[PDB]
C-alpha cells in the first residue's frame, strides 16, 4: 500500500523499517495510511515543544 509521511522533514534512506498507522490525508487519492514519527525509524522530529506525543518527541531538556 502507499503510506504517508508526517512531520515536515524525515530521516529516510529507502530501506528503513518504519511503522504504519491509519488515516486518510484527503489530498492524495490512493494514500490511506499514516506513518508514526516516533517509532522504530523516525525519531523525535525537529524543533517542537508542543503536542510532543504526536511526532514522538520527548520532553525538552529543562
Amino acid at each position: 500500500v502507499t503510506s504517508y509521511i508526517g512531520g515536515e522533514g524525515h530521516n529516510l534512506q529507502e530501506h528503513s523499517v518504519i511503522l504504519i498507522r491509519g488515516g486518510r490525508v484527503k489530498d492524495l487519492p490512493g494514500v490511506r495510511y499514516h506513518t508514526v514519527r516516533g517509532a522504530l525509524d523516525c525519531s523525535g522530529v525537529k524543533d517542537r515543544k508542543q503536542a510532543r506525543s504526536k511526532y514522538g518527541v520527548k520532553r525538552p531538556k529543562a
Binding site: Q13, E14, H15, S16
Partner: protein, 673 residues
C-alpha cells in the same frame, strides 16, 4: 574469599604481520594449557599457581588493523610474533606504532626458526634498528633451520630441550651446547646489565660484583617491560613444538595483570567533562567497554565487552552512557578452559560476551546507572576506498540494506550511503581485501545477490560560448483560451565555481515588455531546465542567463506560459552554445617509502594523475596529484602491490574541471545510445 587473584589474570593480544604463525602458536597454547578465548596456565614445569590467560587473536592484515587497534586499546599486554626469516615487516611497524599509542607493555616471539634463512639475532637487531626499540633476549636459539633443536634460557643458563614424541608437552634442562657457551655468557651479561638498570640498588650490586638472584633478575626485567623501556625477546618453533611453553612462562613472569595497568580514564556524565578514573577492583562501580560486535546465526548479536571495574550479572539493566540507553544485559558465558561456563558474575579484568544488546556499538561504555562514566572514545579512521554495489533483484534490494547495516554495525570502519546523484549504494572500507570480505559475507551469510561496480562519476553540463537573442515563443492560442508567452535571452558561461549557486539570472527587461509578475516564472522555467541538460540530461552548471527582450498578451499571457517560453528559449540557446560534459578531479596525497616512491607515480601517470608536487617526509615522500575520480578506484590494493604494503593515501574532491575532449565525447555518445 581469596579465590584466584586478579593479579593472576593475563589479558594478552597475539599480534603479527600477515603470515607469521600466531593462531598456530595459540593452538599450541590451548593444547599445552588443556583447552577471544580464556585459558589456564600453571607453567611448563607446573611451577606456578593457575593463571587465567584471556587471549585476543588480532588480524595480521592491514585491512583489518582496525580490529587490532580495538584489541590493543582493550588489552593489558601483547605478544609480538616475528618471522625468523622475514624479520621486522612494514606491517609490523604499523602494529608496533598502534601498541605504542596505547602504551601496551609487550614481549617478542621470534617464530619460524625451522625454516631456511632463520636468524634470531638478525631479527633482534631489526627490532632495535627499524622499530627504535630496546630488545633484550631472554633466550638464544640452539641451531637454525632443520638443525633447530631447542633454546637456551639466559636467566637459568640452561638449554631447554622439548620432547618431540609428546609434541613438546615434556621438556628437560640440559647443559648449554659447548659451541654456544661463549655466546650464552655474552648475552647473559647483557641481560643482567639490562636487569641492573631497573633500580639504583640493583645497579650498585652489579657494579659491586654481587650476583643477582633469579628472583631479582625476573622482578627487574618485569618492572622495565611494564614501563615499556625494554622488549623481552623469546624464540622457538611449533610443528616440532618449541618456544611456546617458555613464551607462556614469560607471559606470566613479565606481562601485566589488570592491577599493574594504570586505571582507565573516563569522563563523568555531568555535562562539564569532569575527568574520572576506574581502578581494576570488584568493589568499584561497574564499568565496561564494548569492543567487538559479532553477528551470530543462532543467538543474534554478540557484544564482546571487557569489565574494568565492579561486577555485573547475566541479566542486569546497566546504562550505555555513550548512547544514553538503559541496556539490560543478556546471556553472558565465559570460555572456562574448554567449556563455555555461563557466568552470572563478570568481575573486573574479565572478558565476556553479552547476547541480545540492541543499542550497543563498538566503543560504547556500559556502566552502573547510579555511577555514569564515559570511558575514552575510539577514533575510527576514515574509509580509504569506495565501490558501488547494486542489487540483482528487488528481493536483494531490501536484503542488501539489511545485510550492509549489520556489517556497518559490527565494523565501524565500514561505511554505507546512497549517492544522491547516481542513486547507487556506495560501500566504503579500510582497503579492498576488507571490502572483498564484506561482500563475501553479504553474498553468503545473508546471501544477497549483488553486482560490484565503480562509484558513478558525477557528470555535469555547461556551455563554452555566449549566445545572444535566443527567442522562445510559446504561442498556444488553442483549446478554449490561448496561452501566449514570449522571451528573448542571452546565455553565457561563468567561470567554474565563481558563483556558489552555479547559476546567474539577470533581469534587464526595459519598457515593461514583460509584466514584472511573470519574470519569476521565466527564471523558474530556466531553473527547472538546469536540472536536466539538453546534451545528456545531467544538471547544467556555471551559466549566466540575461532576460532582456520579451512580449505579453493582456488576456492570453500566463505565468507557466512564460515558463514554457523560457524552456524553449533555453533548449535552443543551449544547443547553439557549444554544450560540453564536465568532470570532477580529486586531490590525492600518497605517503610512501623513498625507495617505493617511483612505482607510485608510474601508475598515477597512467591514471591521468597530474602530479602537482611532493613533500619528502620521514617515512619517505608525500606526493600530491590531481587524479580523476574515475581513475581513483581500486587504488588501495594497487598501491599495496607497488609499495609491498607500506603506503597510505588520502583523497578529497578538488574542483569541477573540464573532462578531456576524448573522455567527455565518449560518455556523451554512450549516454545518447
Amino acid at each position: 574469599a581469596r579465590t584466584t587473584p586478579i593479579a593472576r589474570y593475563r589479558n594478552i593480544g597475539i599480534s603479527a604481520h600477515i603470515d607469521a604463525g600466531k593462531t598456530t602458536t595459540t593452538e599450541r597454547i590451548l593444547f599445552y594449557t588443556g583447552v577471544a578465548t580464556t585459558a589456564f596456565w600453571s607453567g611448563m614445569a607446573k611451577q606456578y599457581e593457575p593463571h587465567r590467560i584471556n587471549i585476543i587473536d588480532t588480524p595480521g592484515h592491514v585491512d583489518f588493523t582496525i580490529e587490532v587497534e580495538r584489541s590493543m586499546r582493550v588489552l593489558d599486554g601483547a605478544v609480538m610474533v616475528y618471522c625468523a626469516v622475514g624479520g621486522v615487516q612494514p606491517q609490523s611497524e604499523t602494529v608496533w606504532r598502534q601498541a605504542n599509542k596505547y602504551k601496551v607493555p609487550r614481549i617478542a616471539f621470534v617464530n619460524k626458526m625451522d625454516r631456511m634463512g632463520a636468524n634470531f639475532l638478525k631479527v633482534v637487531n631489526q627490532i632495535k634498528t627499524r622499530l627504535g626499540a630496546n630488545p633484550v633476549p631472554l633466550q638464544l636459539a640452539i641451531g637454525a633451520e632443520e638443525h633447530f633443536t631447542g633454546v637456551v634460557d639466559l636467566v637459568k643458563m640452561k638449554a631447554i630441550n622439548w620432547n618431540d614424541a609428546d609434541q613438546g608437552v615434556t621438556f628437560e634442562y640440559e647443559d648449554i651446547p659447548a659451541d654456544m657457551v661463549e655466546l650464552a655468557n655474552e648475552w647473559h651479561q647483557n641481560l643482567i646489565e639490562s636487569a641492573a638498570e631497573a633500580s639504583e640498588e640493583l645497579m650498585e650490586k652489579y657494579l659491586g660484583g654481587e650476583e643477582l638472584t633469579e628472583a631479582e633478575i625476573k622482578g627487574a626485567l618485569r618492572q622495565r617491560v611494564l614501563n615499556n623501556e625494554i622488549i623481552l625477546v623469546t624464540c622457538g618453533s611449533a610443528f616440532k613444538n618449541k618456544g611456546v611453553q617458555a613464551m607462556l612462562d614469560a607471559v606470566i613472569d613479565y606481562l601485566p595483570s589488570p592491577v599493574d595497568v594504570p586505571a582507565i580514564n573516563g569522563i563523568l556524565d555531568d555535562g562539564k567533562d569532569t575527568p574520572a578514573e576506574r581502578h581494576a577492583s570488584d568493589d568499584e562501580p561497574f564499568s565496561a567497554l564494548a569492543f567487538k560486535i559479532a553477528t551470530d546465526p543462532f543467538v543474534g548479536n554478540l557484544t564482546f565487552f571487557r569489565v574494568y571495574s565492579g561486577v555485573v550479572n547475566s541479566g542486569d539493566t546497566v546504562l550505555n552512557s555513550v548512547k544514553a540507553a538503559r541496556e539490560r544485559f543478556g546471556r553472558i558465558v565465559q570460555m572456562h578452559a574448554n567449556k563455555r561456563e555461563e557466568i552470572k558474575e563478570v568481575r573486573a579484568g574479565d572478558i565476556a560476551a553479552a547476547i541480545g544488546l540492541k543499542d550497543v556499538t563498538t566503543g560504547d561504555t556500559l556502566c552502573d546507572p547510579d555511577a555514569p562514566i564515559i570511558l575514552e572514545r575510539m577514533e575510527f579512521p576514515e574509509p580509504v576506498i569506495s565501490i558501488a554495489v547494486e542489487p540483482k533483484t528487488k528481493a536483494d534490494q531490501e536484503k542488501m540494506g539489511l545485510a550492509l547495516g549489520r556489517l556497518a554495525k559490527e565494523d565501524p570502519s565500514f561505511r554505507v550511503w546512497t549517492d544522491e546523484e547516481s542513486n547507487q549504494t556506495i560501500i566504503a572500507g579500510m582497503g579492498e581485501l576488507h571490502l572483498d570480505i564484506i561482500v563475501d559475507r553479504m553474498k553468503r551469510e545473508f546471501n544477497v545477490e549483488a553486482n560490484v561496480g565503480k562509484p558513478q562519476v558525477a557528470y555535469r553540463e555547461t556551455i563554452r560560448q555566449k549566445v545572444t537573442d535566443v527567442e522562445g515563443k510559446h504561442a498556444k492560442q488553442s483549446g478554449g483560451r490561448g496561452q501566449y508567452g514570449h522571451v528573448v535571452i542571452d546565455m553565457y558561461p561563468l567561470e567554474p565555481g565563481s558563483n556558489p549557486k552555479g547559476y546567474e539570472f539577470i533581469n534587464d527587461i526595459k519598457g515593461g515588455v514583460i509584466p514584472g509578475e511573470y519574470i519569476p516564472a521565466v527564471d523558474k522555467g530556466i531553473q527547472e531546465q538546469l536540472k536536466a541538460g539538453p546534451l545528456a540530461g545531467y544538471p547544467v552548471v556555471d551559466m549566466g542567463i540575461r532576460l532582456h527582450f520579451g512580449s505579453y498578451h493582456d488576456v492570453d499571457s500566463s505565468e507557466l506560459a512564460f515558463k514554457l517560453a523560457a524552456s524553449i528559449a533555453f533548449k535552443e540557446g543551449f544547443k547553439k552554445a557549444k554544450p560540453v560534459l564536465l568532470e570532477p578531479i580529486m586531490k590525492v596525497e600518497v605517503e610512501t617509502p623513498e625507495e617505493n616512491t617511483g612505482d607510485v607515480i608510474g601508475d598515477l601517470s597512467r591514471r591521468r594523475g597530474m602530479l602537482k608536487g611532493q613533500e619528502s617526509e620521514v617515512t619517505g615522500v608525500k606526493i600530491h596529484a590531481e587524479v580523476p575520480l574515475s581513475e581513483m578506484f581500486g587504488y588501495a590494493t594497487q598501491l599495496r602491490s607497488l609499495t609491498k604494503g607500506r603506503a597510505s593515501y588520502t583523497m578529497e574532491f578538488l574542483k569541477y574541471d573540464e573532462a578531456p575532449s576524448n573522455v567527455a565525447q565518449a560518455v556523451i555518445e554512450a549516454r545518447g545510445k
